[PDB]
Amino acid sequence: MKVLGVVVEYNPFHNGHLYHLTSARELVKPDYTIAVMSGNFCQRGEPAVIDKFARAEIALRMGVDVVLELPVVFATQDAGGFAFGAVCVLDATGVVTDVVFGSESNDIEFLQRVARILYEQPDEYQKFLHEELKKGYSFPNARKYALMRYFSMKGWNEEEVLKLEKSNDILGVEYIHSALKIGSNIRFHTIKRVGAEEKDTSFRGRFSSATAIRNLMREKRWEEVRDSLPEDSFEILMREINEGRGPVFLENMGDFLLSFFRLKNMDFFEKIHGFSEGLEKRFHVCARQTGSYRDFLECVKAKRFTFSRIRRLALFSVFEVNKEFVEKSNTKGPQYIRILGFTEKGREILSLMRKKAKLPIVTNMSLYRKVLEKTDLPVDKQLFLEQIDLDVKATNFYSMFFPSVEQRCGERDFSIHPIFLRT
Amino acid sequence: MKVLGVVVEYNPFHNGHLYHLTSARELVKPDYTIAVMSGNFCQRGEPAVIDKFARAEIALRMGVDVVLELPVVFATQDAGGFAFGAVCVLDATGVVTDVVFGSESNDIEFLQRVARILYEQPDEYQKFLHEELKKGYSFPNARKYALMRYFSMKGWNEEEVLKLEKSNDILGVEYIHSALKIGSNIRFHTIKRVGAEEKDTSFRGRFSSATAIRNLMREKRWEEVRDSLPEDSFEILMREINEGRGPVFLENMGDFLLSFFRLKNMDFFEKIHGFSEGLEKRFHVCARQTGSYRDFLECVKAKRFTFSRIRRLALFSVFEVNKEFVEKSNTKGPQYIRILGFTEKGREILSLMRKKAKLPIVTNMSLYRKVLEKTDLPVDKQLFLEQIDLDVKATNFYSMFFPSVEQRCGERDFSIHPIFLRT
């Protein structure tokens, strides 16, 4: 049979995402569609505009059969751990055959060559990369340059590597690389991304970028927002807004983040994952000097530091995510498959997953301890506990920023139940 | 000569405080007046309405010659450590002879008897207290009851002990007890407190309680506030408000405190000072269940838990103040005398203090390391560093809640300089 896996965020779900899903499904023509989705926190280092349950419901109503949660530790990282975690989950399902993503290049063979190079790690490219790293650049630039040197050395075209400056292509290459790391049989497909780039903050019609739409939400223009969204997506959006669970933006968390950083000392950041190049110093100082989170991001950021990375380090710092645990997670991968939602068609493939899963499947949250105790699968139990605790902590922290105080009460992992769509 | 020490908070400074200072100075007729004052955080577990520098300036302009800061670790505790720290500082000055405080009982001999009992710790009273503690009460009630039993056993009147249910009397008894603990020669005096009780939240004329005046500030009634304050005090108040450094209330910190508590686990609170009777549990749960800080305080509080104690534990939890460090501080006492301010008359007695001080004196904050290194006095250096770091951290955290973002920038311990009043 054919089961189409997809790696998604949907912050929010717009017409471009619908077009993507449609074209992908029509390309594969699968018997099922499984979607691994980010939680209440995305990759950019920004919180989701609405929580994961509403977005999972939207995903289900847009033609996704089953919605799985990507663990927060793999969600808030850069392309490497993100792709690692995602591919690991989709492979851990056991039923996933095909996986389709968006791309600017629309060249799969090229991305596969690049991923092959980054996987096999030839001694040549390692010498080059060693040199460029010693030259004082950052990792993305050093890897780009070294790959260009390898491509010129092998007689190929090094101007092709420019294609890899696009976000989706990086994500794809890292996907393939991860699959080659854990040895997944999953077939990967690319479809040309049509719309505004993810780094484009300006609104033009549809399909506007997620950032542009979020900005439109900030300005309280709901007509352009409604024009940029499908009917059901906009409906669920306004539903979550009117009940006081949204919208949620980073600047709301900003004061908390800064005040929390002012409390911590130099060592704390040296413990937290992703801290190097004296970023512990810069964090410690800028936290005390700046009066707001925007100014903080401006201060910490230099020519060599992107907004995304710094935001990621902020989220890693606020949850006390430490290098050791992150290393274990980046080695063994996720210890579980969390089920966010399913349709009536979803119960089928999910039931097959109950058999073919390489990882413990979690539906009822209150029972997850029982699941970890009664599972025949040989998983690290401590890593399991720490990961799921990080997920619950992330959701619980996300809940506080609900506009309505009444909605802030209780733990929404245990209280809320997996979204079930009747047909 | 005669130097009058006083233990104060001034949140804010009102007509009652002026009356107190006047009557005290007229009682002692000293040659100098030294005031040990709480920092940006008071005993009740609430932040000061305005920062410590403005309040120190007010204190200086109201006839206090020198203003010293009580270390945050002794400021945010209950009566025992508060009195301990205060008495320790005033004694550490070396120049302090007399100390006057307010009282409902206006009986010094009685408080001295009580303090004598609590100091010498007779075996009898210890058996009684052991029994009442085993009976399942809390410490204040058990001590009150045991003291009543001792007073009845010794033939004295046990209905006198009722006097000790008043806040000021508790503070006084603990003062005397502390002085008897570290062997201070300081003479203690009591003057009848005239005005509303500190636990009275309703506004009547003058002298209204500090809480009543703060509540009047919350309601934006500035005429009643102006009527409840001296000219200079009100002037400095409005000065700090208009420049956007005030007012500061606990509910503003509430969201931060709750969200910060949701991040921490069971063990964290077991590390933090003042946690027992399963308060770690209650904290861990109520933090996740409640949506606001008021509801949190309501939840954690039971028949046996006062608002003050819980607020104190909140402040202790947010600064990561741990039992060990607090024990060391409650043993050796403060390691330094921080100078908040002085007048031209203050330089004299301060210069004498440069000689007779039993503890290192700190004026310039940027130089405090140099001071700790070049001091001939035999003080614990690590305890010194940890304490002063806790002070700076407290101020830095307090700065974030300034209404004006522009005022949130920088560390105000190092940037701001000791208030100097020219005559």
PDB file of N, CA, C and O in Angstrom, chain A residues 389 392-393 396-397 399-400 407-412 414, chain B residues 258 260-266 269 280-291 296 299:
ATOM      1  N   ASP A 389       8.250  14.753  29.787  1.00  0.00           N
ATOM      2  CA  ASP A 389       8.150  15.778  30.818  1.00  0.00           C
ATOM      3  C   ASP A 389       8.437  17.145  30.215  1.00  0.00           C
ATOM      4  O   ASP A 389       7.821  18.142  30.591  1.00  0.00           O
ATOM      5  N   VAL A 392       5.214  18.115  28.249  1.00  0.00           N
ATOM      6  CA  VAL A 392       4.166  18.580  29.158  1.00  0.00           C
ATOM      7  C   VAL A 392       4.511  19.947  29.747  1.00  0.00           C
ATOM      8  O   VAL A 392       3.642  20.810  29.885  1.00  0.00           O
ATOM      9  N   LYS A 393       5.783  20.142  30.079  1.00  0.00           N
ATOM     10  CA  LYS A 393       6.248  21.419  30.611  1.00  0.00           C
ATOM     11  C   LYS A 393       6.084  22.530  29.580  1.00  0.00           C
ATOM     12  O   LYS A 393       5.688  23.648  29.916  1.00  0.00           O
ATOM     13  N   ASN A 396       2.326  23.326  29.328  1.00  0.00           N
ATOM     14  CA  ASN A 396       1.929  24.026  30.547  1.00  0.00           C
ATOM     15  C   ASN A 396       2.420  25.469  30.577  1.00  0.00           C
ATOM     16  O   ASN A 396       1.710  26.358  31.044  1.00  0.00           O
ATOM     17  N   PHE A 397       3.634  25.698  30.083  1.00  0.00           N
ATOM     18  CA  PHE A 397       4.173  27.052  30.009  1.00  0.00           C
ATOM     19  C   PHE A 397       3.456  27.860  28.933  1.00  0.00           C
ATOM     20  O   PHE A 397       3.224  29.059  29.092  1.00  0.00           O
ATOM     21  N   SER A 399       0.386  27.540  28.073  1.00  0.00           N
ATOM     22  CA  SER A 399      -0.985  27.809  28.504  1.00  0.00           C
ATOM     23  C   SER A 399      -1.145  29.147  29.233  1.00  0.00           C
ATOM     24  O   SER A 399      -2.214  29.756  29.191  1.00  0.00           O
ATOM     25  N   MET A 400      -0.084  29.597  29.896  1.00  0.00           N
ATOM     26  CA  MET A 400      -0.133  30.810  30.712  1.00  0.00           C
ATOM     27  C   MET A 400      -0.398  32.074  29.904  1.00  0.00           C
ATOM     28  O   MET A 400      -0.886  33.071  30.437  1.00  0.00           O
ATOM     29  N   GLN A 407      -8.728  30.267  30.920  1.00  0.00           N
ATOM     30  CA  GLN A 407      -8.228  29.191  30.073  1.00  0.00           C
ATOM     31  C   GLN A 407      -6.837  28.722  30.492  1.00  0.00           C
ATOM     32  O   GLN A 407      -6.331  27.728  29.975  1.00  0.00           O
ATOM     33  N   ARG A 408      -6.222  29.442  31.425  1.00  0.00           N
ATOM     34  CA  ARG A 408      -4.861  29.125  31.853  1.00  0.00           C
ATOM     35  C   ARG A 408      -4.817  27.954  32.833  1.00  0.00           C
ATOM     36  O   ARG A 408      -3.754  27.393  33.096  1.00  0.00           O
ATOM     37  N   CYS A 409      -5.974  27.587  33.368  1.00  0.00           N
ATOM     38  CA  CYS A 409      -6.041  26.572  34.413  1.00  0.00           C
ATOM     39  C   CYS A 409      -5.813  25.156  33.882  1.00  0.00           C
ATOM     40  O   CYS A 409      -6.225  24.823  32.771  1.00  0.00           O
ATOM     41  N   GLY A 410      -5.138  24.337  34.684  1.00  0.00           N
ATOM     42  CA  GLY A 410      -4.976  22.922  34.400  1.00  0.00           C
ATOM     43  C   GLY A 410      -3.940  22.559  33.353  1.00  0.00           C
ATOM     44  O   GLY A 410      -3.505  23.403  32.570  1.00  0.00           O
ATOM     45  N   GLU A 411      -3.552  21.285  33.345  1.00  0.00           N
ATOM     46  CA  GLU A 411      -2.608  20.766  32.361  1.00  0.00           C
ATOM     47  C   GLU A 411      -3.359  20.214  31.156  1.00  0.00           C
ATOM     48  O   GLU A 411      -4.119  19.254  31.271  1.00  0.00           O
ATOM     49  N   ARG A 412      -3.133  20.823  29.997  1.00  0.00           N
ATOM     50  CA  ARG A 412      -3.931  20.532  28.812  1.00  0.00           C
ATOM     51  C   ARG A 412      -3.468  19.286  28.067  1.00  0.00           C
ATOM     52  O   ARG A 412      -4.114  18.857  27.113  1.00  0.00           O
ATOM     53  N   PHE A 414      -3.052  16.297  29.764  1.00  0.00           N
ATOM     54  CA  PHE A 414      -3.866  15.275  30.410  1.00  0.00           C
ATOM     55  C   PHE A 414      -5.364  15.562  30.311  1.00  0.00           C
ATOM     56  O   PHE A 414      -6.163  14.647  30.115  1.00  0.00           O
TER      57      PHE A 414
ATOM     58  N   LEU B 258       3.993  32.700  38.739  1.00  0.00           N
ATOM     59  CA  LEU B 258       3.231  31.489  38.456  1.00  0.00           C
ATOM     60  C   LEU B 258       3.838  30.707  37.291  1.00  0.00           C
ATOM     61  O   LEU B 258       4.051  29.491  37.386  1.00  0.00           O
ATOM     62  N   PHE B 260       6.811  30.815  36.228  1.00  0.00           N
ATOM     63  CA  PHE B 260       8.120  30.340  36.661  1.00  0.00           C
ATOM     64  C   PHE B 260       7.974  29.100  37.534  1.00  0.00           C
ATOM     65  O   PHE B 260       8.811  28.200  37.489  1.00  0.00           O
ATOM     66  N   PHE B 261       6.908  29.057  38.330  1.00  0.00           N
ATOM     67  CA  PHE B 261       6.651  27.905  39.189  1.00  0.00           C
ATOM     68  C   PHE B 261       6.205  26.693  38.377  1.00  0.00           C
ATOM     69  O   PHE B 261       6.495  25.555  38.746  1.00  0.00           O
ATOM     70  N   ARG B 262       5.505  26.938  37.273  1.00  0.00           N
ATOM     71  CA  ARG B 262       5.063  25.848  36.405  1.00  0.00           C
ATOM     72  C   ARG B 262       6.237  25.118  35.752  1.00  0.00           C
ATOM     73  O   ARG B 262       6.120  23.955  35.369  1.00  0.00           O
ATOM     74  N   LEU B 263       7.365  25.808  35.626  1.00  0.00           N
ATOM     75  CA  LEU B 263       8.551  25.235  34.999  1.00  0.00           C
ATOM     76  C   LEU B 263       9.312  24.309  35.942  1.00  0.00           C
ATOM     77  O   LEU B 263       9.888  23.309  35.516  1.00  0.00           O
ATOM     78  N   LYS B 264       9.321  24.654  37.225  1.00  0.00           N
ATOM     79  CA  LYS B 264      10.088  23.904  38.210  1.00  0.00           C
ATOM     80  C   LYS B 264       9.382  22.615  38.624  1.00  0.00           C
ATOM     81  O   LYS B 264       8.158  22.509  38.538  1.00  0.00           O
ATOM     82  N   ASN B 265      10.165  21.637  39.068  1.00  0.00           N
ATOM     83  CA  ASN B 265       9.635  20.345  39.487  1.00  0.00           C
ATOM     84  C   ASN B 265       9.606  20.200  41.010  1.00  0.00           C
ATOM     85  O   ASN B 265       9.938  21.136  41.740  1.00  0.00           O
ATOM     86  N   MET B 266       9.212  19.019  41.477  1.00  0.00           N
ATOM     87  CA  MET B 266       9.066  18.735  42.902  1.00  0.00           C
ATOM     88  C   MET B 266      10.354  18.961  43.699  1.00  0.00           C
ATOM     89  O   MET B 266      10.318  19.508  44.799  1.00  0.00           O
ATOM     90  N   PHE B 269      11.673  22.761  44.804  1.00  0.00           N
ATOM     91  CA  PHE B 269      11.119  23.368  46.008  1.00  0.00           C
ATOM     92  C   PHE B 269      11.672  22.708  47.264  1.00  0.00           C
ATOM     93  O   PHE B 269      11.802  23.353  48.304  1.00  0.00           O
ATOM     94  N   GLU B 280       5.965  21.721  49.080  1.00  0.00           N
ATOM     95  CA  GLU B 280       6.539  21.492  47.759  1.00  0.00           C
ATOM     96  C   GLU B 280       5.471  20.903  46.844  1.00  0.00           C
ATOM     97  O   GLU B 280       5.301  21.337  45.703  1.00  0.00           O
ATOM     98  N   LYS B 281       4.758  19.908  47.366  1.00  0.00           N
ATOM     99  CA  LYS B 281       3.626  19.298  46.679  1.00  0.00           C
ATOM    100  C   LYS B 281       2.585  20.346  46.301  1.00  0.00           C
ATOM    101  O   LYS B 281       2.288  20.541  45.121  1.00  0.00           O
ATOM    102  N   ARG B 282       2.025  20.999  47.316  1.00  0.00           N
ATOM    103  CA  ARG B 282       1.002  22.027  47.129  1.00  0.00           C
ATOM    104  C   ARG B 282       1.417  23.090  46.113  1.00  0.00           C
ATOM    105  O   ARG B 282       0.617  23.498  45.275  1.00  0.00           O
ATOM    106  N   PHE B 283       2.671  23.524  46.185  1.00  0.00           N
ATOM    107  CA  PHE B 283       3.206  24.482  45.225  1.00  0.00           C
ATOM    108  C   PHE B 283       3.176  23.904  43.815  1.00  0.00           C
ATOM    109  O   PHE B 283       2.615  24.509  42.898  1.00  0.00           O
ATOM    110  N   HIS B 284       3.763  22.720  43.663  1.00  0.00           N
ATOM    111  CA  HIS B 284       3.845  22.033  42.376  1.00  0.00           C
ATOM    112  C   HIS B 284       2.478  21.849  41.719  1.00  0.00           C
ATOM    113  O   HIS B 284       2.336  22.004  40.505  1.00  0.00           O
ATOM    114  N   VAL B 285       1.477  21.516  42.527  1.00  0.00           N
ATOM    115  CA  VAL B 285       0.125  21.277  42.032  1.00  0.00           C
ATOM    116  C   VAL B 285      -0.595  22.586  41.715  1.00  0.00           C
ATOM    117  O   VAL B 285      -0.987  22.827  40.570  1.00  0.00           O
ATOM    118  N   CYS B 286      -0.778  23.415  42.740  1.00  0.00           N
ATOM    119  CA  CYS B 286      -1.483  24.688  42.605  1.00  0.00           C
ATOM    120  C   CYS B 286      -0.916  25.576  41.500  1.00  0.00           C
ATOM    121  O   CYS B 286      -1.655  26.335  40.875  1.00  0.00           O
ATOM    122  N   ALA B 287       0.389  25.487  41.262  1.00  0.00           N
ATOM    123  CA  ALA B 287       1.003  26.257  40.184  1.00  0.00           C
ATOM    124  C   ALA B 287       0.444  25.831  38.831  1.00  0.00           C
ATOM    125  O   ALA B 287       0.211  26.663  37.954  1.00  0.00           O
ATOM    126  N   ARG B 288       0.227  24.529  38.672  1.00  0.00           N
ATOM    127  CA  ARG B 288      -0.294  23.986  37.424  1.00  0.00           C
ATOM    128  C   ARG B 288      -1.808  24.159  37.304  1.00  0.00           C
ATOM    129  O   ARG B 288      -2.331  24.328  36.203  1.00  0.00           O
ATOM    130  N   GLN B 289      -2.509  24.110  38.434  1.00  0.00           N
ATOM    131  CA  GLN B 289      -3.970  24.200  38.423  1.00  0.00           C
ATOM    132  C   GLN B 289      -4.509  25.628  38.315  1.00  0.00           C
ATOM    133  O   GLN B 289      -5.466  25.877  37.582  1.00  0.00           O
ATOM    134  N   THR B 290      -3.902  26.560  39.043  1.00  0.00           N
ATOM    135  CA  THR B 290      -4.389  27.938  39.072  1.00  0.00           C
ATOM    136  C   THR B 290      -3.989  28.724  37.824  1.00  0.00           C
ATOM    137  O   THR B 290      -2.979  28.426  37.189  1.00  0.00           O
ATOM    138  N   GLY B 291      -4.797  29.722  37.472  1.00  0.00           N
ATOM    139  CA  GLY B 291      -4.539  30.544  36.304  1.00  0.00           C
ATOM    140  C   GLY B 291      -3.957  31.910  36.623  1.00  0.00           C
ATOM    141  O   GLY B 291      -3.487  32.619  35.732  1.00  0.00           O
ATOM    142  N   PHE B 296      -3.536  31.379  43.087  1.00  0.00           N
ATOM    143  CA  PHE B 296      -2.449  30.525  43.551  1.00  0.00           C
ATOM    144  C   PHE B 296      -2.255  30.675  45.056  1.00  0.00           C
ATOM    145  O   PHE B 296      -2.166  29.685  45.785  1.00  0.00           O
ATOM    146  N   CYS B 299      -5.126  29.077  46.811  1.00  0.00           N
ATOM    147  CA  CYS B 299      -5.046  27.620  46.771  1.00  0.00           C
ATOM    148  C   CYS B 299      -4.023  27.063  47.756  1.00  0.00           C
ATOM    149  O   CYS B 299      -4.345  26.200  48.571  1.00  0.00           O
TER     150      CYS B 299
END
